[PDB]
């Protein structure tokens, strides 16, 4: 009963980070070594666990969040970070237990003329709490004057397309990101390694 | 390698007109906003006008009240700012700027905020007696 | 958290040895790459050692160079032999926590950077 990690890492399309996708992984055998024992991931950072020993671990649930951001923003997918992504789109908690895995996806997610389908929230009144998702589209009042349903200077549509192009510099290329959250609940484990 | 070149600035008397041009080269994006901004001496830069590439939708700062018109020539990759009824308050360096547009839920969205992806070097406009 | 390089004049045919020693963290899980930049040229990848210990060489030139790591001393070594004048450059070590066999040739993907040491031939 293998965990469906392939459906996560090899999905044809990924979510925009402001509307990041969560998949619950439950009641299965998890082979993390297929992920770690590869040359595929420029980022593979674990918090609270060792990447070599993931197949020894047992959890009640594992959550797989996934989305696309720019290369220069992958560092924000970490406990304690700040920036447009950590602040307004996807926030990890200080006490995060899990792994952040990322890889360049210029070959799939860029387009000549720009791929506009991947968005991020550029304006927000306050920072997100950990694992909060905000998909609202209210006009953002950047100044003292109320916007009253009209966009203009200081009255902004809050989401922005990246517009990935294959000629972008690597820091501006799309990266697919998968965050595995390991749920630590005192209850029967349903996700264990092969062993 | 987008490059923006502003021309058409200069000196004008109060009540006169000017037509600025922003000639864009190297634009590879399909959808983008172009904005005109200005910085009067000793003050922060502010937006003046915004136009969207796909349909030519526009917005203006309140300061402009009907006297400026932004428009695009697609065949020349050039965006114009027609400035009428110019006043001394209008003295400033005018910059054009370009930034990537947005697609959401079947429609495009265009925003000229203080942060733009690309900037021209600017052209001086002086309104004096 | 820091990377410190050591080991940089010398003239053709000689050998030099560069070391990248880290402080504030353990380098076992990181890939370490060496990049160099000569004046008036682009920054270029030299060699990389993955967390697994595997070696990769990027520049067709150096394919004369060897790379190794001492996890115990938390250091990585680059051995340069048959030095030429075209090898004159500032050398940088960089660290990145990727998958076990990952070793990337593109310097933009590395998180941590050393100070850089000049090698002149
Ligand atoms: C998602 O990608 C491929 C699907 O083809 C799976 O396998 C990778 O590609 C080939 C196919 O055998 C092999 O190199 C390895 O099996 C995989 N690559 C590497 C570098 O290990 C891959 O396992 C899938 N990911 C899952 C299931 O998590």
- Chain A residues with CB under 8 Å of C102 CB are 38-42, 44
Cα distances (angstroms) measured from residue C57 to each of A41, C91, C95, C117? 19, 15, 16, 20
Assess contact for A176 and A101: CB atoms under 8 A. Answer: no
**Hey, what are A102's tokens?**
């990322």
> For the CA atoms of B73, B76, B79, B84, what is the dihedral angle to 10 degrees?
-70
| Beta-bridge mates of residue B12 | B127
Q: Which domains does chain B have, with CATH numbers?
A: 3-127 (2.60.40.10)
Q: Is the minimum distance from the CB of A40 to ligand 1 under 6 angstroms?
A: yes
Q: C-alpha angle A18/A20/A21, rounded to 5°?
A: 160
Is there an interface between B and C (3+ Cβ pairs < 8 A)?
no
The residue in chain A having the minimum alpha-carbon distance to the alpha carbon of residue C54 is: A39
Beta strands in B40-75 (DSSP E): 46-52, 58-60, 68-73
> For the CA atoms of A166, A170, A171, A177, what is the dihedral angle to 10 degrees?
80
CA of B80 to the centre of ligand 1 (A): 53
Distance CA B127, CA C121 (A): 61
Burial (CB count <10 Å: 0-12, 13-18, 19+), residue B69: middle
Q: How was this structure determined?
A: X-ray
Assess contact for A25 and A3: CB atoms under 8 A. Answer: yes
| Beta-bridge mates of residue C5 | C20
């Amino acid at each position: 009963n293998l965990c469906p990690f392939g459906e996560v890492f090899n999905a044809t399309r990924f979510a925009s980070v402001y509307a990041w996708n969560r998949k619950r992984i439950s009641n299965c055998v998890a082979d993390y070594s297929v992920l770690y024992n590869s040359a595929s991931f420029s980022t593979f950072k674990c918090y609270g666990v060792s990447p070599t020993k993931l197949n020894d671990l047992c959890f009640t649930n594992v959550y797989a969040d996934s989305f696309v951001i720019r290369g220069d923003e992958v560092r924000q997918i970490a406990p304690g970070q700040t920036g447009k992504i950590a602040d307004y789109n996807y926030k990890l908690p200080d006490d995060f237990t899990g792994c952040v895995i990322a890889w360049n996806s210029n070959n799939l997610d860029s387009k000549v003329g720009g791929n506009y389908n991947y968005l991020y929230r550029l304006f927000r009144k306050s920072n997100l709490k950990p694992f909060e998702r905000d998909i609202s589209t209210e006009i953002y009042q950047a100044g003292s004057t109320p916007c009253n349903g009209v966009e203009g200077f200081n009255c902004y549509f809050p989401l922005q397309s990246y517009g990935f192009q294959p000629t972008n510099g690597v820091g501006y290329q799309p990266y697919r990101v998968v965050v595995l959250s390991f749920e630590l609940l005192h209850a029967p484990a349903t996700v264990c390694g092969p062993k | 390698q987008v490059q923006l070149v502003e021309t058409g600035g200069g000196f004008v008397q109060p009540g006169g007109s000017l037509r600025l041009s922003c000639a864009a080269s190297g634009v590879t994006l399909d959808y983008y906003a172009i904005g005109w901004f200005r910085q009067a001496p000793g003050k922060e830069r502010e937006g003046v006008s915004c136009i969207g590439s796909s349909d030519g939708r526009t917005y203006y700062s309140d300061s402009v009240k009907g006297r400026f018109t932004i428009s695009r020539d697609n065949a020349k990759n050039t965006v114009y700012l027609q400035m009428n009824s110019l006043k001394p308050e209008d003295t400033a360096v005018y910059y054009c700027a370009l930034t990537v547009g947005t697609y959401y839920s079947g429609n495009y969205h265009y925003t000229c905020s203080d942060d733009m992806d690309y900037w021209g070097k600017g052209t001086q406009v002086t309104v004096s007696s």
